[PDB]
Design a binder for these strands. Structure first.
Length: 113
RNA sequence: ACUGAAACUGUAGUAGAACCAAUCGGGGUCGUCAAUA
């Protein structure tokens, strides 16, 4: 089955990424912005530079240069799991327990987590 | 009912002045998929 509402519609227009230079929120001003939908950009006011490691033997050689720990499974995020990704109110309230999946992305007054 | 002759379209003049190839982005991470008996 398809849920009735696309997640983009459960996000408030004031929270979607900015679409003009007038609506730049604090992080868009501090870190900068580029419009993904047309013209518009702003160079960020915060610049990170001169990163240096102070320790010399900082990397963990596990014992030989050819060792390698196999690293669990980093699976892909799956927002179809509405009980994890969807919220009952645009304040980000988790969904109620016990309701069937048809409830997930249901009302327009639902929200994202 | 006696052709005028002779005469460099030439001389001087910088396609140049100003202009940032640049703005934003963690090499990151979990539950799905199939429909019947």
């Amino acid at each position: 089955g398809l849920y009735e509402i696309a997640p983009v519609d459960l996000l408030d227009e004031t929270l979607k990424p900015a679409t003009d230079k007038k609506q730049l929120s604090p992080a868009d001003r501090v870190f900068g912005w580029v419009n993904q939908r047309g013209n518009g950009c702003y160079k960020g006011q915060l610049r990170i530079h001169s990163v240096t490691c102070q320790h010399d033997d900082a990397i963990d050689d596990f014992g030989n240069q050819n060792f390698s720990v196999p690293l669990a499974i980093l699976g892909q995020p799956k927002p179809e799991q509405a009980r994890f990704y969807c919220a009952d109110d645009r304040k980000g309230i988790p969904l109620e327990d016990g309701y069937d999946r048809d409830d997930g992305y249901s009302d327009s007054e639902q929200g994202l987590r």
